[PDB]
Amino acid sequence: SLPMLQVALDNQTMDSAYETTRLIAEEVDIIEVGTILCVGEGVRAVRDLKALYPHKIVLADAKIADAGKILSRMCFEANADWVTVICCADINTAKGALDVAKEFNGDVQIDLTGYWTWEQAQQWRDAGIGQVVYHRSRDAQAAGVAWGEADITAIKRLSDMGFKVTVAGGLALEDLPLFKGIPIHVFIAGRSIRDAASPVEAARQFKRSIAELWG
């Protein structure tokens, strides 16, 4: 199978986000309401984007740290398909978000930005979490942290634990070959699509490269 492409809408306002979606909504598989757009506009962003693009998967990247049931329910009532819970959260937070998700036929991903352990990863699997976002912090990226050997190893180990792994964090087109041969579920691109001279062509380039690399 080919890795899917997720666009991150890390825009501060809905009209900024629409400037991207009007160009690339049909060029990508998943539309992410980024954490920045969740904070800028609140959960209406989820409701509105799903109303515009009801045939697409809409992910609310809320990076829930606690109050798993309440915050997941807000996102799902706004018609989210998927929500994110941050890796450090108490296990009951992921569990709570998962129970709500099942009411709505949605799903939960654990976002792996920052500091987590393999013991925690086992708890997620035991709790019934099936997706994780292996995620380089943009702030670490800005401080020179590059994709590398240890990432490939960890991504493979997560996959062998039975998770579908999404990869994210300042991904550029030139980074995709690093991941060749690994059954990546989804690649997320925010800035490398939204900020391109032609977002459409940026998205199509990611799709072509993926098709070549995983074909």
Ligand X SMILES: O=C(CO)[C@H](O)[C@H](O)COP(=O)(O)O
Q: Which residues pair with 112 in a beta bridge?
A: 134
Q: Is 111 in the site for Mg ion (CB under 5 A)?
A: no
Applying CB under 6 A, the span of 18-26, 44-52, 114-122, 164-172 interacting with ligand X comes to 164-172
Count of beta carbons in the 10 Å neighbourhood of residue 153:
10
Is 191 annotated as a binding-site member? yes
Closer Cβ to ligand X, 119 or 174, answer by number: 174
**How far is the C-alpha of 84 from the C-alpha of 82, rounded, in Å?**
7
Q: What are the residues whose beta carbons fall under 8 Å from the beta carbon of 85, sequence distance 6 or more?
A: 63, 64, 65, 68, 72, 93, 94, 97, 108, 109, 110, 111
**Directed axis angle between helix 68-77 and helix 91-103, to 10°?**
30
Count of beta carbons in the 10 Å neighbourhood of residue 26:
11
Q: What are the residues whose beta carbons fall under 8 Å from the beta carbon of 77, sequence distance 6 or more?
A: none
Considering only residues 23 to 52 of the shown chain, the ones binding its own copies according to CB under 8 A are 35-36, 38-45
> Which of its own copies, Mg ion, ligand X, none is residue 170 near (CB under 5 to 8 Å by kind)?
ligand X
Site string for its own copies, 151-190 (x = CB under 8 A): ----------------------------------------
Least Å distance, CB 96 to ligand X, is 13
DSSP letters, 51-66, are: HH-TTSEEEEEEEE-S
Is 90 annotated as a binding-site member? no
Is 10 annotated as a binding-site member? yes
Considering only residues 22 to 81 of the shown chain, the ones binding ligand X according to CB under 6 A are 34-35, 61, 66-67
> Which of its own copies, ligand X, Mg ion, none is residue 90 near (CB under 5 to 8 Å by kind)?
its own copies
Q: Is 61 in the site for Mg ion (CB under 5 A)?
A: yes
Q: Are 169 and 189 in contact (CB under 8 A)?
A: no
Q: What are the residues whose beta carbons fall under 8 Å from the beta carbon of 98, sequence distance 6 or more?
A: 68, 108, 127, 128, 129
- Nearest residue relative to ligand X (C-beta): 190
Give me the residues that bind ligand X (CB under 6 A), please. 8, 10, 34-35, 61, 66-67, 138, 168-171, 188-192
Give me the residues that bind its own copies (CB under 8 A), please. 10, 12, 35-36, 38-45, 62-63, 65-71, 74-75, 86-90, 92-93, 95-96, 111, 113-117, 120, 135, 137-140, 142-143
Known binding-site residue numbers for Mg(2+) = 32, 61
